[PDB]
Design a protein around this ligand. Structure first.
Ligand SMILES: *[C@@H]1O[C@H](CO)[C@@H](O[C@@H]2O[C@H](CO)[C@@H](O)[C@H](O)[C@H]2NC(C)=O)[C@H](O)[C@H]1NC(C)=O
Length: 358
């Protein structure tokens, strides 16, 4: 499109991820690998606002970005993930979301959005790009047979709508999460997905700030695979470019000339999964293509690193109340600590296996 949110901006580098990376790098014993690991702190990632407790951090990042821009003559851009739906992750065996539909989820989520908007409103010289609710709308395409998802459908739609409508009022550029090629990219899922995303876009007023969709968030697919990963058999859309090329024209027909961003933060190593749906701490993952607007596609505004590499996707300990058995599969790195906590061995392998190399 004419307006790529990243062009002309300096991306703000997360100091939190930077702090995690710095602490991790000093524990890597091989000196050459340690220096490569430390440099990961210079690679832009998205900040996950996975609870209300993260909102004060957002405020600090906006204010810091505003000052860094003035100190360097740059316009700064802060990258965030909106990730706090009530009954979050409806199809997962376990979820860490703090809100529940049964306990005023809609009002609590609205207040979470209001607090985020109130921060963003104070720093108008900082641009914000937001990924909207990973692991939400995609469940409403394929997983309505999951009772928790069926029962969450109206709340997910209302809450996502509230986020889109209100973040647009402060000029946030937004990409709705849209799963990945092995979820919504199956040819038979493309039209139901397009119909749902279009309805969501319409309900939020077709705001020009709703730029399009984010794909492969927290996943491992290639953007453009050298050859199809065996997990993809049966799906001609075996990588993200095939998925996006197939979905984008369906959105165009609705009047939404959508553009896309694609997570490649853990895509450096292909052919590491037994089944396509295995998502938790996949063993042998490597850092992938660094964020760039040089995407190879008319539809793709940026390759991005949405999910921060090194933060555990979930514990492998079956005695934890947050245990999801996906995290103990044979292709999941184990033992793995609780979701969000640092997984040092996994980070070291992400560095060692990076492709392109760091
Ligand atoms: C695996 O999960 C279990 C349950 O969460 C953990 O065992 C408990 O740990 C807490 C303190 O961390 C104690 O209050 C409980 O009494 C423990 N229960 C038992 C049966 O030991 C266990 O620590 C976890 N293991 C790892 C490596 O995280």
């Amino acid at each position: 499109s004419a307006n790529n949110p990243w062009t002309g901006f300096q991306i703000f580098l997360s100091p939190y991820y930077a702090n995690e990376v710095a602490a991790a790098a000093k524990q890597i014993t091989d000196p050459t690998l340690s220096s490569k690991a430390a440099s990961v702190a210079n690679i832009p990632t998205f900040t996950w606002l996975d609870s209300v407790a993260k909102i004060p951090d957002l405020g600090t990042y906006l204010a810091s970005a505003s000052a860094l821009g003035k100190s360097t003559g740059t316009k700064q851009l802060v990258q965030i993930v909106i990730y706090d739906l009530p009954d979050r992750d409806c199809a997962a065996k376990a979820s860490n979301g703090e809100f529940s539909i049964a306990n005023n989820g809609q009002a609590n989520y609205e207040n979470y959005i209001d607090q985020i908007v109130a921060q963003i409103q104070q720093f108008p010289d900082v641009r914000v790009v937001a990924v909207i609710e990973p692991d939400s709308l995609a469940n409403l395409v394929t997983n309505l047979n999951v009772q928790k998802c069926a029962n969450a459908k109206t709340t997910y739609l209302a809450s996502v709508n509230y986020a889109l409508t209100n973040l647009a009022k402060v000029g946030v550029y937004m990409y709705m999460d849209a799963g990945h090629a092995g979820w919504l990219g199956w040819p038979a899922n493309l039209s139901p997905a397009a119909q749902l995303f279009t309805q969501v876009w319409q309900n939020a007023g077709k705001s020009p700030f709703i730029k399009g969709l984010a794909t492969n968030v927290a996943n491992y697919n290639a953007l453009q695979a050298a050859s199809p990963d065996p997990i993809t058999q049966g799906n001609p859309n075996y990588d993200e470019i095939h998925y996006i090329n197939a979905l984008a024209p369906l959105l165009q027909q609705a009047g939404w000339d959508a553009t896309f961003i694609v997570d490649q933060g853990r895509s450096g190593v292909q052919n590491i999964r037994q089944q396509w749906g295995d998502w938790c701490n996949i063993k042998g993952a490597g850092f992938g293509t660094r964020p760039t607007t040089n995407t190879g596609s008319q539809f793709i505004d940026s390759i991005v690193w949405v999910k921060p590499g090194g933060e555990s996707n979930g514990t492998s300990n079956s005695s934890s109340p947050r245990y999801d058995s996906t995290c103990s599969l044979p292709d999941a790195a184990q033992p793995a600590p609780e979701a969000g906590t640092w997984f040092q061995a996994y980070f070291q392998t992400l560095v060692s296996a990076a492709n392109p190399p760091l």
